[PDB]
Paper text:
In order to identify novel [name] effectors, we used Foldseek18 to search for proteins with structural homology to [name] domain of the Cam1 effector. This method rendered a 600-residue protein containing an N-terminal [name] domain followed by a linker region and a C-terminal adenosine deaminase (ADA) domain, with accession number HAJ98955.1 from an unknown Bacteriodales bacterium (hereafter named [name]-associated deaminase, [name]-associated adenosine deaminase 1 [[name]]), for which homologs were already identified in a previous bioinformatic screen. [name] is located immediately downstream the cas10-csm genes of a type III-A [name] locus. Further analysis of [name] homologs showed that over 70% associate in genomes containing type III systems (mostly belonging to the A and B subtypes) and exist within many unique phyla of bacteria. These data suggest that [name] is a widespread effector in type III [name]-Cas systems. Altogether, these data demonstrate that [name] deaminates ATP molecules to [name] through the formation of an hexameric complex that requires a Mg+2 or Mn+2 cofactor and an activating cA4 or cA6 ligand. While the triggering of a growth arrest in the host is a common strategy of all [name] effectors, we believe that [name] introduces a new mode of defense for [name]-Cas systems that couples nucleotide deamination activity to a sequence-specific, RNA-guided adaptive immune response.
First, we used SECMALS to analyze the oligomeric state of the protein and found that the majority of [name] forms a hexameric (403 kDa ± 0.451%) species in solution, with a small amount of the dimeric (139 kDa ± 1.1%) species and of a higher molecular weight (5–31 MDa) megadalton fraction (peaks “H, ” “D, ” and “M, ” respectively). To understand the organization of the protein at the atomic level, we solved the cryoelectron microscopy (cryo-EM) structure of hexameric apo-[name] at 3.6 Å resolution. Consistent with the SECMALS data, the structure displayed a trimeric arrangement of [name] dimers forming a homohexamer. The dimeric deaminase domains form the core of the hexamer by arranging themselves with 3-fold symmetry and are linked to the [name] head domains through a 51-amino-acid linker (L1, inset). Further, we observed that the dimeric [name] head groups are tilted to one side with respect to a vertical axis from the center of 3-fold symmetry (black dotted arrows). The tilting of the [name] domain around the L1 linker brings it close to the deaminase domain on one side and distant from the deaminase domain at the opposite side (labeled as “closed” and “open, ” red arrows). On the other hand, mutation of W349, which interacts with its counterpart in another [name] dimer via π-π stacking of aromatic rings (inset), led to the detection of a stable dimeric complex by SECMALS.
Residue numbers in the entry:
A (entry chain A): 361 to 600
B (entry chain B): 1 to 251, 300 to 502, 515 to 600
C (entry chain A): 121 to 192, 200 to 240
D (entry chain E): 361 to 480
Write the structure that this text describes.
């Protein structure tokens, strides 16, 4: 209803789709995972609509008790229907976990995956498969620590993730808790990853466009609108 | 590195030596544009530059225009000046230029040339005494009366600096039959900018293979459906051939090619044919086991190593002479037997892994092929546990499930073999779920036009969004090359246009198993070449 | 429109070039319409009139970008949104500049995902 | 070359065959195991010669964390092509890992296994 009423007045409307979180060991019995994925696929079968459900999510606390290599057999059918999976294989997750997530679950996206830099073959396969990597600048910056934190030495791996060719996407996670929307989440990179250029920000937007689980024709329309709008913005960007 | 200098001199010819001596570091080449007026004194700069043979120098004369008097005179001078500037550009460098010489008109025209093509640094010179002979200008610069003045540092337009390929076939721009093609370039750029800024519907986007600087007439021509007379244009277009079997070229194979000499001749002749077809990249599937000879100490590993070595030697020779070359990588085909010695599949996989482990060499091993009889007897539900090994070492896998196959076979070939590329599968139309899967996962299709020839779903495949790549399979067996492969789509798929051909090439170039760096270099070279070829073809 | 005026005799008095234009001696020379860049005039808002000024307060606002146009392969073919090619080269090299803190306005105006 | 030179002079020569050790590499980019298996398979496939590679060996980090009950699925190809298998385990391991090694990898040789006396 919000999207329809925004479009009927021919204003700027933010097209939105959902994601069904299937948490692991978050409420007790693990049958909640199957309840969630069945709900997701049944919601997908609505057929007609504007704001649809595109896929499911797999999120956990740290590891082991929330590993990503436990529910492949459950995931077979829901994957077979035509949804997509964004495994949260990262944030101090061992490389075997992400390998299982990308290869046994066929997950098209990864959460964080900050320490991917130390698994060269995992890089090679991810880059070769153009698998998106959602990552939250401010959230990971607060909860882990990257330069310029005081009393810290580790630095953010974004610039490396870009020049290697990973389809990185910048996100917000929890706006209220982090206290940062997408605008400052993109702006923070200037002092987070020194030497980053605006052109790489444009490529990041392009990758975020590419990694969305959306239909082809909607993709062409979205690319056309984004390119026209981006040209207009950059035309009156150099004014200031 | 060449610090080429361009200048224009009117009544005063002293200015060029002043520009040369303005920077003590010293230039390498100097060129001066001047009309055919008699007031010029070429002898002074002539012998001044003859004092230093080590620095190149040339003089070009604008015939027929003593001075700029009317609109035709100025437009003629501007066109000739632009032609001279663009014919004297460095191949891969921005030049320097001084505007001091000449009257205001040619100074403004030269600065406009700089603003259109770009320059390393434009500058001026100031003489307090306005010297006329070499000794006194030398004394002025020794004292400090010399003054050099600089504002400009501009990249220029790469696209309009890139149109120098059209200068030939003009005889020298004689006024009787002169066409100001540089004026065509300027009207092109202004037309594109104005159309872009004066509309929104046309201003959407359009060209994904990246270009968007061609004249609007060129874009309209691209939008029209292609005809059968575009053969020269498509032949001039660089192409990619992701599915070509080595053993099916001079149709041969197991019975003849066991000896080394036949393999060498086959390799060299195949590379020559590929370069002749302007193919810039290709992936080759070869059967080392079918080619080995244990009797003559010819192992399959030896055959593959010899193939890799001769390919590397050939591409190195082609690159060292700075001529167009065709980068090619090999694919180890896991030939299907399913009757005896079933360990041959494992042997092939181990051979492919060890071959890619070579590391060094511009030509290497990037993927394996699951070809053979694609019937139900050899579907993808047999050896996935063994393919875990090849997938562990980061090796691409190409499947082939396109003839006499049911949708579920394609499905678990996609989801158990995890084929990053898919072959054929012409009957994908009848499986909308499989359409959604292949489109969402962005896995390509190795559809071969002539192979199925010997309603085509190609057009519908493009409409859906499948990354379809046109491939030749076997040029020797089919008797037609890749150029004919794109040619036959004119009547195979009516309503097909050249823009779709460009998108097919783009899909092919993203679909190849290549590193990100090599992929983006190939994209750069391909974009350069397509821009140049369409610019050349649109005029003729 | 930027153009040029040429006079064969270079008149000095009003009647002279009045008669010259009556005959049509003065010719008109232009190299065509120049769009410039569609939006650069906010410099005149951020920089006041500054009627009281001297050589001390020079503004090298654009000249540093001009120097860093080419003074600085990865950033060459990373072009998305193919219509970005039509963008004038000065803004292209401006995009090639490293990111900074003061680009918050453009970031907010940036359509994001 | 060494054995051929020794034999040409009709002296006493020690015939020598190779063993491609598949080092455990607890994490160590574990694809090295498949790399070693492929290398051994193709080395055996080279064939012609008097000195030859005859089998593979797995060892290193003998502790239970790197037992032989993990890679039982990879060893199918190396066994099918015709190579030989050796498994080093038993210096301080449980009396069950040997059973898996002999009956899953079909190892024809057992490294050490000093504590076999307590498993009749
Ligand atoms: Mg989250
Ligand atoms: Mg074929």
């Amino acid at each position: 209803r919000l999207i329809t009423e925004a479009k009927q007045k021919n204003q700027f409307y933010c097209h939105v789709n959902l994601l069904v979180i299937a948490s692991r060991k978050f409420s007790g019995d693990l049958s909640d995972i199957s309840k969630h994925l069945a709900l997701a696929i049944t919601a997908m079968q609505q057929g007609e609509g504007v704001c649809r459900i595109v896929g499911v999510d797999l999120a956990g606390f740290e590891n082991k008790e929330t590993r990503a290599s436990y529910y492949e057999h459950d995931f077979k059918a829901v994957h077979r229907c035509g949804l997509a999976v964004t495994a949260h294989a990262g944030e101090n997750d061992d490389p075997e976990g992400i390998w299982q997530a990308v290869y046994s679950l066929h997950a098209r996206r990864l959460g964080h995956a900050l320490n991917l830099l130390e698994a060269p073959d995992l890089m090679r396969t991810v880059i070769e498969r153009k698998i998106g990597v959602e990552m939250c600048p401010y959230a990971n910056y607060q909860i882990k620590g990257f330069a310029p934190m005081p009393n810290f030495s580790a630095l953010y791996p974004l610039k490396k993730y870009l020049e290697a060719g990973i389809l990185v996407s910048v996100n917000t996670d929890n706006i209220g808790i982090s206290g940062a929307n997408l605008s400052e989440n993109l702006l923070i990179l200037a002092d987070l990853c020194p030497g980053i250029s605006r052109m790489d920000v444009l490529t990041i937007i392009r990758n975020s466009i590419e990694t969305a689980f959306i239909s082809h024709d909607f993709r062409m329309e979205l690319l056309k609108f984004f390119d026209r709008k981006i040209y207009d913005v950059c035309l009156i960007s150099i004014k200031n | 590195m060449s610090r080429v200098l361009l200048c224009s001199a009117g009544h005063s010819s002293m200015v060029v030596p002043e520009a040369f001596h303005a920077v003590p570091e010293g230039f390498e080449e100097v060129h001066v544009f001047t009309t055919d007026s008699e007031k010029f004194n070429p002898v002074v700069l002539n012998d001044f530059f003859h004092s230093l043979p080590n620095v190149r120098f040339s003089i070009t004369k604008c015939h027929g225009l003593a001075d700029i008097l009317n609109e035709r005179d100025f437009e003629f001078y501007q066109e000739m000046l632009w032609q001279w500037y663009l014919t004297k550009m460095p191949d891969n460098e921005l030049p320097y230029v001084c505007l001091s010489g000449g009257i205001k008109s040619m100074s403004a025209s030269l600065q406009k040339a700089a603003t259109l093509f770009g320059a390393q640094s434009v500058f001026h010179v100031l003489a307090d005494n306005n010297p006329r002979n070499i000794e006194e200008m030398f004394d002025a610069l020794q004292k400090g009366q010399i003054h050099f003045i600089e504002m400009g540092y501009e990249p220029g337009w790469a696209a309009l600096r890139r149109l120098k390929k059209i200068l030939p076939i003009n005889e020298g721009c004689s006024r009787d039959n002169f066409k100001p093609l540089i004026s065509k370039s300027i009207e092109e750029i202004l037309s594109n900018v104005k159309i872009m800024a004066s509309d929104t519907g046309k201003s959407n986007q359009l060209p994904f293979p990246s270009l968007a600087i061609l004249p609007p007439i060129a874009q309209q021509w691209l939008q029209l459906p292609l005809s059968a007379n575009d053969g020269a244009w498509i032949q001039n277009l660089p192409k990619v051939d992701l599915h070509c079997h080595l053993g099916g070229f001079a149709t041969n194979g197991s019975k003849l090619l066991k000896d080394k000499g036949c393999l060498i001749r086959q390799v060299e002749l195949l590379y020559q044919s590929l370069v002749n077809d302007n193919v810039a990249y290709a992936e080759i599937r070869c059967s080392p086991n079918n080619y080995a000879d244990k009797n003559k100490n010819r192992s399959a590993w030896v055959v593959l190593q010899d193939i890799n070595d001769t390919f590397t030697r050939l591409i190195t020779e082609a690159k060292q002479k700075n001529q167009f070359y065709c980068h090619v990588n090999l694919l180890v085909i896991a030939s299907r037997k399913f009757s005896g010695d079933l360990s041959d599949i494992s042997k092939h996989l181990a051979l492919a892994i060890t071959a890619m482990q070579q590391g060094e060499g511009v030509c290497r091993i990037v993927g394996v092929d699951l070809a053979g009889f694609e019937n139900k007897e050899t579907r993808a539900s047999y050896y996935e546990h063994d393919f875990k090994a090849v997938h562990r070492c980061g090796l691409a896998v190409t499947a082939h499930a396109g003839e006499n196959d049911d949708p579920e076979g394609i499905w678990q070939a996609v989801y158990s073999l995890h084929a990053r590329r898919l072959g054929h599968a012409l009957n994908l139309l009848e499986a909308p779920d499989l359409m959604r899967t292949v489109i969402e996962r962005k896995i390509g299709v190795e559809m071969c036009p002539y192979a199925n020839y010997q309603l085509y779903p190609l057009k519908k495949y493009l409409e859906a969004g499948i990354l379809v790549s046109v491939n030749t399979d076997n040029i020797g067996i089919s008797g037609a090359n890749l150029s004919e492969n794109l040619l036959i789509l004119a009547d195979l798929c009516p309503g097909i246009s050249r823009m779709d051909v460009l998108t097919i090439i783009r899909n092919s170039i993203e679909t190849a198993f290549i590193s990100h760096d090599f992929r983006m270099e190939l994209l750069k070279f391909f974009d350069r070449k397509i821009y140049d070829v369409c610019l050349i073809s649109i005029k003729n």
